[PDB]
Every structure is written in structure tokens, then in C-alpha cells.
Design a protein around this nucleic acid. Structure first.
Ligand SMILES: [Zn+2]
Lengths: 162, 722
DNA sequence: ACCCGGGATAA
DNA sequence: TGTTTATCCCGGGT
RNA sequence: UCCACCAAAGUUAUCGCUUUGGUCAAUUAAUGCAGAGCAACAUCCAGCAAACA
């Protein structure tokens, strides 16, 4: 079970660290893709990817490392890969899942849930959960707005694997 | 070695340096104007003399020199050397000046000042002459035939005979036989007599029609005769002797109300047209130079404007013998770069023998060229339980064309559509002098707006084509962001959303602001907005955050961005060309994939009864492409290959009536008999385990396979299909 | 006076 | 159907 | 003058037919593709609103 960590800065001020534990056994492909993107060994990664979308009480989103506005991003396996499975559900806060434009359109963008989202079950792939830094997650969420625009610029200053 | 030329397509955005972009826009936008007049004015002259005296010998005037003089007369310049003027040049200039003032008054045209225009007229005018010749060759003979059909009153006689035989209750076979013999054989005799410059047999044509033939023949010389006893071949061989004859034929056709056709070519399109930008033209017009440019300095001068290090400009071809000679063509958006290897200084499968036919065993693929479906391909090894079939439809190849047509029609402003409707109300192909003058006046009235609308890519734009227009960002079901119709991007991570519940308008305004920010970051959108407009839009976006509810900022932003809806028509044409090339490549790839590289192509001819002459079917074009890709191709007779059932060779008949799918014909014919579905008249098929149904193309390919097998086994076409 | 356009012609 | 490049004279400006 | 493509079934080699599943760069973008070599472009015009069975 791979564990990854992010160090986040808002307007150049560090705010904390968030640690995610992935479901490598149940969701191997998505977890491997996320780990590879975090490491950046292949040549691209989440390093410097802004949190272009944060809806308070709903979600945080990120992983756009080519446009920084939600239009970019690409997985290690290519532009798109089929949905793996839906054996996990958005039942608790802090669950990490892949953002997509529809069925079988998963890329490199990801989002973190802040409240139960039963309606998202069966349409998005969940492959990990937050194990530490949930307070940092709430701090980041507080900077968002319902429209998704953030009150201040927030970027993933550093990313890595433990 | 023989001279050959190749062309490379490119865009001005990639090869042309910015500093020298604006002058080119000034050049092309001017040339395309003058050239247009160079047509119309010429026709004007040909209508003022002929309308006054048909004896005027305008045949000599159909030459490049006359068109060059006409083009020059439209350009204002300092007086030249009158001593060196040739007598022919003097006569041409006097003839032009006889009507110059009248034409300028009618067209409301003013001489455009353009120095060094002589080097330009030599190119464009060279094309003008080409328009006069080819057009005639493309339309004379056929149109002549049409006139004969009207002279013989073919349609009226056919209708009368049809009514008489319906009264007599004759069957379809009897009616068709009676027509094809009684009504056609005399028509064929008359056509042959006219072809061999001989008056037709008396009694087959009335006086009002014999007079037309006599008048038409009076145009030619007494001793002149058609080469190879064929007027149709003579026109192509010696077009110079048919210009007056072609004009008289057009006059007669207009008198008899035949389908309009343009006797004198005219440039009607308002979009800028491609022009050849020679090294001299580049030196004197684009570079704004004022001294001679020799061949040695030609490449140096060219390099100052375009990047010769690009992939397109470098040598190409086997042994890279083709070199760029500083000559290209462009219309302000697209560029055709020409390369040459020389200096600029001045068979039916049924007719194949055994040794040839028997080499394709297991390699033949039978292709039916359907009228709607461009190709229906079936491999001879195909089985009923294992289908090996491919279909290439005309709709697929025209997808981009239809999409661009829809975009053009939906985005057409009210003023533009009204102007086009007004202009179309005046006949253009008619040779009548008064109607031509009316058309010239209408075009002069509407040009001020039409050229501005269609020149938006390069020319200045000041008219508000979309006044009081409100545009709001929208997302389709596939997560593509559109402004009103422009494509911004695809937000591939947009699907995750909560329950919307539009509690507040401020959230919607913030979403609009986010969409605007995303749009402004696009490379293909930012370049279309000047610095002042971009700053104003940014200020409005900033103010929207302070006052999201107010719609004034959104209206102002929409007014500022309204320029984006102006379609880049030249870019659309370039995209259409690219799509056509890619579709041809896709067809070739699919043929090689689903049938393999060993496929041998057999193509049909027509569904009409048997013919034994030219019959210029459109398929003649497609065959050119396939052979260029390395596919062997052969022809097979098709006139009777769709009338018998492959299973038992019995007669096939259409049986299902369905609503007409063609919208323009539904009202005139709500229901029509299906053409692509057939059934065998024999009922024993049910015993084999109703009648046996077939697709037209499937039956045709099966019959082609049977014919191929018969040829292989006995070396003779089946008697049934003969 | 002496050189620089710009049109016209020609292969 | 087509894919240009030189030479000559004189009116004007310095 | 509207109609992107592939496959299963009504269905028998079944249609501008019907019910499903799969395919996508969307485009007012780019000269196109392969994986550094290849590729005819432009004016007029026939397109279809049928000019020759
Ligand atoms: Zn049968």
C-alpha cells in the first residue's frame, strides 16, 4: 500500500502537508498512475500543479500540470485509460478519486472529497484515502468558494512518496 | 528530362514573417478586386459591340494581350512611352477606352493606383484566357446536344407517346422499346447530320427549328469542316473557330429557355482568390523595393520575407531534384509553394487474356460505385456466413463540407444574407446586355459590405454585424466549452459536480468569469484580440467580481468579443482541402486493412442501359486516385448486372414503398419505391429455407463475381448479362 | 548635366 | 490550362 | 439539399428500416501521415436543384 505526501503553499506561504494512502491491491492501475505522477520519474508530475478548483464542503481538485485550469493533464499510460472499477464509494471525507469528463475518460486530474458523496458512486474511481493532514485539507478548503474559484492561489509546492 | 511540378500546402502563420504580412494583405485584396473587373469589364465590351453589330469579329480579342490591356486600363499610372506601342496594343487600348467611361459610371469604379502592375497582369490574365477556352470545351458540345433535344422537341414527343400508349395500355417494355426506336433513331440521325455539318432529313424538324440550324451553321466558314467528321472533337481540337459559334449557341439556348450557362466566364466569389506572388512582385509590392531584382539576388530577397529553413521550402522528391524557384501562390491565408526540376527561363476485366486474368485468383475485390454510396466493396472470397464487405459513403467524405456549410449559413448576418438574396435576384449567366448591366450595378451596390464581410481575415472590419448580441458560455454533453458557437477547449475534468441548486446568481457570474479567463488563455483566441480590447476585457472581468449581478459588464464583453464569430473562410477552405486529403488516405488505409495489400479492384460503370461511347461518368475521377496508390483497377460492365437474382438468375423487382427521404422532394412525392432493396420474383426460395431479399449493391457484386468466374472458366461474358 | 524611376515590349 | 525574366526610352529631380 | 463510422439481432448476404454495444481532436486548430520520406496546386466550371438513352 503506497503512501504519498504533498507539501502545499498558498501565495508562497507553506500551509502544511497532506498524506494519502492508496489502494494498490484493489485499484492497481490508478494507484500506480498516481504514484508515478507524484514521483515525476517519467518526466511530468503534479509538482507545481495548482488547485484550480475548490468547492467548500464539496471537494478539492488538482493535478493539472500542463494548463493549471482543469483543461490539461495526461496519464502515464496515455491521454485516457478505461475506468478500473467502483469497488470503493465516496462514503467518508478525505477520499481521493480521479476526475473525468465521463465514462472511461480518466486522465491525470484528481479530486479529494470533504463530505459523503453517495451520488458520485458508480461514476468515479476511488483509489486512496487521506491518512494525515486532514486539518490542512480543511485549511485549503476554507480558501475556496462555492463557484470553485479560490480566494488565493494554491499550488502543490512539492510531492513525493514515503 | 520532362518538366514536372509539385505543390506543398502551408499557412501564412507558419512561413511568413510578421513584418511583411500587412503589405501582402494590401496586395491580394487589391489584385482579387482588379481581376474580377478584368472579367466583367471584358464581358461588358463584348456585349456593347455584339449587341450593336453581330458581325464584330471578337474572336481575335480572345487573347492574353487583350486581357492584359483591360487589366491595365483599370490601373492609374503615369503616362508611358507612346512610341513603342504596338498597333494591336493601340487598337486594344482604343477599344477599351471607347467604353471605359461608361463601364466606370455603371460599376461606380475608380482607377486603383498600383505601380508595377504590368508584372501582375501577365499572370492573372494568363488564367483569364484559360477560363474562356476550357469553359467552352467543357460546355459547348454537351449544350449543343441539349439544343438539339429542344429542336427535336424530344420531351413533348415522349410525353405524347407515353400518353397514347397508356391509352392503349402497353406494358413498360413495349413503351420503352417504342420510344427507344421511333423517337430516338430519328434524333440520332439528326444529331449525326448536325455533327457532320449536314442538314438533317427534311420533315424531322419544323421550320422554326430548321431556321435555328441554318443560323448556327451560318457562323462557320463555307469551306471549313469539322476535323475527323466530329464537331464535338473539332471543338476540342480547334476551339478558336467556335467562339462566335459558341456565342450564337448560347443566344439560341437563351431563346429556347435552356438551362442557363455562362458563355463568358466571370469571377463572382467575393472571398479573396489565390494569386501568384512572383519574385518581382515580392520585390516591387511586398518588399516595397524600388530597384531591379536579378536571379542571383532572387533567393536573398525571398529569404527576407519567408523562412526558407522550414520543412516545406527545402528540396523534395526522388533524388531531391525538385527545387523551390521563388514562385508561390497565396490568397492571404493559405499558401501553395511550387517546386520544379527545370529553370524558369523561357482495361476492362472482360478483355483481359488468360495470362493476365488468371493471375488475380483470390485477389479480386468487386466494387460497386453506388450513386449515394461511393463504393461498396466485397472480396471474391467472401462467404454468406463470413461477410467480408466494406462501404465508403459519399456522406462520410462530405462531412466536413456539410459542417462548414452549416457554420456559414448559421453565422450569416442579416445584412449579408439580405445582400446575397438581392444580388442573386439578378441573372448572371445571361448574355443580355441590359441584364448584365443591372447585375453590375447590383454588385457595385453590395460590394462595399460583401467584401468587408468576406475580407475580415485580413481587411479592416468596422461594421457591427452582430449588434445588441448577448453571448454566454455553455458546455455540451461532452464537456466542450463554447462561447456562442466558437470552440474554446474541452474541460476534461468538468464532469464532477454537486447538486446545482442555483441559490444565487453570483455563483453563475463567477462561473462565467472563470470560463472567460479560461477562454482568454487560449492561443488561437488571444491573437485575435488587440492589446486595447484585451485590456478592456480584463478590466470588465475584474469589475464583474465586484458586481457579479450586473449584466452590463457581460454585454460589453460580448460586444467586444463579437469579432470572433467572423468565420475565417479561407481557413475553412484550407481545412476542407486537408479533410479531403485525409479522407482519401483513410479510404486507402481501410481498403488495405480490411482487404489486404493484395486486393485487386473491379469497378462498375453505370446503372443505365448499355452505352458504347464517352459517357463522361463522374467515376472517371475517382479511378485516378486509386491507381496512384498502387491498387490495380479494372472495369466491368454493369448495365444489366442488377436485373437478375444471383441465387437463381431470375428477375429482380423493387417491392417496398417508403416515405421519400429527400426533403425537397417529399412534398412533390411523399412516398417512393425503394431502390436499394430488391426481391426475386421466384417463390421457391421459401422452400430452400416469402421471396429472397437482396441489397442492390450486394446483388451487383454477386453478379460481378459470377461474371468474373465465367470469364475465368470460359473466357466469355454470360449470355444473360450480355 | 547625369542618375533614378516606371511603363512598355519581348523571348 | 499554367507554374518569369530581361532590355530600352524619357521625364523628372538634384 | 438534411444524413460520422463499426458490429449483434428482426433477417434469408434485408433497406436513407428498427432495438442495442462500441468507436472520437471536440475544433472559427494545425500543411497531413509515418514514426530523419513521401503528398499537385490554382482561375473558370460540372456538383444537387438531372446535362445524353
Ligand atoms: Zn433466387
Amino acid at each position: 500500500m503506497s503512501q504519498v505526501y504533498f507539501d502545499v503553499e498558498a501565495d508562497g506561504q507553506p500551509i502544511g502537508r497532506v498524506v494519502f494512502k492508496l489502494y494498490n491491491d484493489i485499484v492497481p492501475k490508478t494507484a500506480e498512475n498516481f504514484r508515478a505522477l507524484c514521483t515525476g520519474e517519467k518526466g511530468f508530475g503534479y509538482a507545481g500543479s495548482p488547485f484550480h478548483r475548490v468547492i467548500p464542503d464539496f471537494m478539492l481538485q488538482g493535478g493539472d500540470f500542463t494548463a493549471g485550469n482543469g483543461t490539461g493533464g495526461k496519464s502515464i499510460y496515455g491521454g485516457k485509460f478505461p475506468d478500473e472499477n467502483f469497488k470503493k464509494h465516496h462514503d467518508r471525507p478525505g477520499l481521493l478519486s480521479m476526475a473525468n469528463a465521463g465514462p472511461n475518460t480518466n486522465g491525470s486530474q484528481f479530486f479529494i472529497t470533504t463530505v459523503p458523496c453517495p451520488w458520485l458512486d458508480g461514476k468515479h474511481v476511488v483509489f486512496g484515502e487521506v491518512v494525515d493532514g486532514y486539518d490542512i485539507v480543511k485549511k485549503v478548503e476554507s480558501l475556496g468558494s462555492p463557484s470553485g474559484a479560490t480566494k488565493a492561489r494554491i499550488v502543490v509546492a512539492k510531492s513525493g512518496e514515503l | 528530362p520532362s518538366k514536372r511540378v509539385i505543390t506543398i500546402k502551408t499557412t501564412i502563420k507558419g512561413i511568413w514573417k510578421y513584418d511583411y504580412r500587412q503589405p501582402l494583405y494590401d496586395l491580394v485584396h487589391t489584385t482579387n478586386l482588379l481581376v474580377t473587373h478584368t472579367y466583367a469589364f471584358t464581358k461588358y465590351i463584348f456585349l456593347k459591340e455584339l449587341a450593336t453589330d453581330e458581325n464584330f469579329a471578337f474572336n481575335e480579342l480572345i487573347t492574353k494581350d487583350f486581357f492584359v490591356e483591360v487589366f491595365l486600363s483599370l490601373v492609374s499610372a503615369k503616362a508611358g512611352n507612346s512610341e513603342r506601342l504596338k498597333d494591336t496594343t493601340k487598337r486594344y487600348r482604343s477599344l477599351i477606352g471607347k467604353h471605359k467611361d461608361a463601364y466606370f459610371e455603371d460599376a461606380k469604379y475608380t482607377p486603383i493606383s498600383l505601380a508595377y502592375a504590368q508584372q501582375i497582369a501577365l499572370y492573372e490574365c494568363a488564367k483569364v484566357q484559360t477560363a474562356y477556352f476550357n469553359n467552352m470545351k467543357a460546355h459547348f458540345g454537351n449544350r449543343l446536344r441539349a439544343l438539339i433535344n429542344k429542336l427535336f422537341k424530344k420531351k413533348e414527343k415522349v410525353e405524347s407517346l407515353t400518353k397514347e400508349m397508356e391509352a392503349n395500355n402497353f406494358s413498360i417494355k413495349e413503351i420503352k422499346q417504342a420510344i427507344r426506336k421511333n423517337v430516338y433513331q430519328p434524333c440520332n440521325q439528326v444529331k449525326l447530320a448536325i455533327t457532320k455539318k449536314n442538314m438533317p432529313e427534311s420533315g424531322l424538324l419544323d421550320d422554326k427549328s430548321v431556321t435555328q440550324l441554318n443560323e448556327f451553321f451560318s457562323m462557320y466558314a463555307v469551306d471549313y469542316t469539322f476535323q475527323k467528321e466530329s464537331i464535338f472533337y473539332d471543338v476540342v481540337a480547334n476551339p478558336e473557330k467556335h467562339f462566335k459559334a459558341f456565342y450564337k449557341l448560347a443566344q439560341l439556348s437563351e431563346a429556347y429557355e435552356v438551362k442557363p450557362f455562362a458563355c463568358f466566364p466571370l469571377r463572382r466569389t467575393f472571398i479573396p482568390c489565390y494569386m501568384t506572388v512572383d519574385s518581382k512582385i515580392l520585390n516591387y509590392h511586398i518588399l516595397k523595393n524600388k530597384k531591379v531584382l536579378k536571379m542571383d539576388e532572387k533567393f536573398n530577397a525571398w529569404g527576407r520575407v519567408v523562412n526558407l529553413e522550414r520543412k516545406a521550402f527545402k528540396s523534395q522528391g526522388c533524388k531531391k531534384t525538385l527545387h523551390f524557384q521563388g514562385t508561390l501562390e497565396t490568397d492571404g491565408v493559405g499558401v501553395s509553394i511550387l517546386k520544379q526540376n527545370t529553370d524558369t527561363n523561357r482495361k476492362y476485366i472482360e478483355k483481359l487474356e488468360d495470362a493476365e486474368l488468371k493471375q488475380t485468383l483470390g485477389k479480386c475485390v468487386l466494387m460497386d460505385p453506388g450513386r449515394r454510396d461511393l463504393l461498396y466493396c466485397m472480396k471474391e472470397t467472401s462467404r454468406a456466413d463470413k461477410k467480408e464487405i466494406m462501404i465508403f459513403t459519399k456522406n462520410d467524405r462530405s462531412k466536413c463540407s456539410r459542417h462548414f456549410r452549416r457554420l456559414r449559413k448559421l453565422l450569416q448576418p442579416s445584412q449579408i444574407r439580405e445582400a446575397e438574396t438581392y444580388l442573386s435576384g439578378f441573372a448572371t449567366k445571361s448574355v443580355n446586355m441590359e441584364k448584365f448591366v443591372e447585375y453590375i450595378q447590383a454588385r457595385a451596390s453590395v460590394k462595399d459590405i460583401l467584401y468587408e464581410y468576406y475580407g475580415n481575415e485580413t481587411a479592416k472590419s468596422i461594421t457591427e454585424f452582430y449588434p445588441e448580441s448577448q453571448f454566454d458560455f455553455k458546455v455540451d454533453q461532452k464537456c466542450n466549452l463554447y462561447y456562442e458557437n466558437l470552440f474554446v477547449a474541452k474541460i476534461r475534468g468538468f464532469y464532477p459536480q454537486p447538486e446545482h441548486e442555483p441559490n444565487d446568481i453570483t455563483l453563475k457570474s463567477h462561473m462565467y468569469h472563470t470560463y472567460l479567463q479560461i477562454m482568454l488563455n487560449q492561443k488561437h483566441i488571444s491573437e485575435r484580440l488587440n492589446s486595447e480590447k484585451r485590456r478592456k476585457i480584463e478590466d470588465l472581468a475584474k469589475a464583474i467580481l465586484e458586481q457579479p449581478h450586473e449584466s452590463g459588464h457581460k454585454t460589453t464583453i460580448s460586444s467586444l468579443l463579437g469579432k470572433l464569430r467572423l468565420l475565417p473562410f479561407r481557413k475553412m477552405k484550407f481545412s476542407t482541402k486537408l479533410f479531403s486529403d485525409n479522407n482519401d488516405r483513410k479510404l486507402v488505409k481501410n481498403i488495405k486493412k480490411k482487404f489486404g495489400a493484395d486486393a485487386v479492384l473491379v469497378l462498375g460503370n453505370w446503372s443505365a442501359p448499355n452505352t458504347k461511347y464517352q459517357d463522361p461518368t463522374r467515376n472517371k475521377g475517382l479511378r485516378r486516385m486509386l491507381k496512384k496508390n498502387g491498387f490495380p483497377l479494372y472495369l466491368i460492365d454493369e448495365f444489366r448486372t442488377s436485373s437478375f437474382c444471383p441465387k437463381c438468375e431470375s428477375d429482380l423487382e423493387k417491392f417496398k414503398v417508403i416515405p421519400n427521404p429527400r426533403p425537397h422532394n417529399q412534398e412533390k412525392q411523399p412516398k417512393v419505391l425503394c431502390h436499394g432493396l430488391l426481391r426475386c420474383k421466384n417463390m421457391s426460395c421459401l422452400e430452400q429455407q416469402n421471396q429472397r431479399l437482396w441489397n442492390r449493391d450486394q446483388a451487383a457484386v454477386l453478379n460481378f463475381r459470377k461474371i468474373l468466374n465465367c470469364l475465368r472458366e470460359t473466357k466469355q461474358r454470360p449470355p444473360l448479362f450480355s
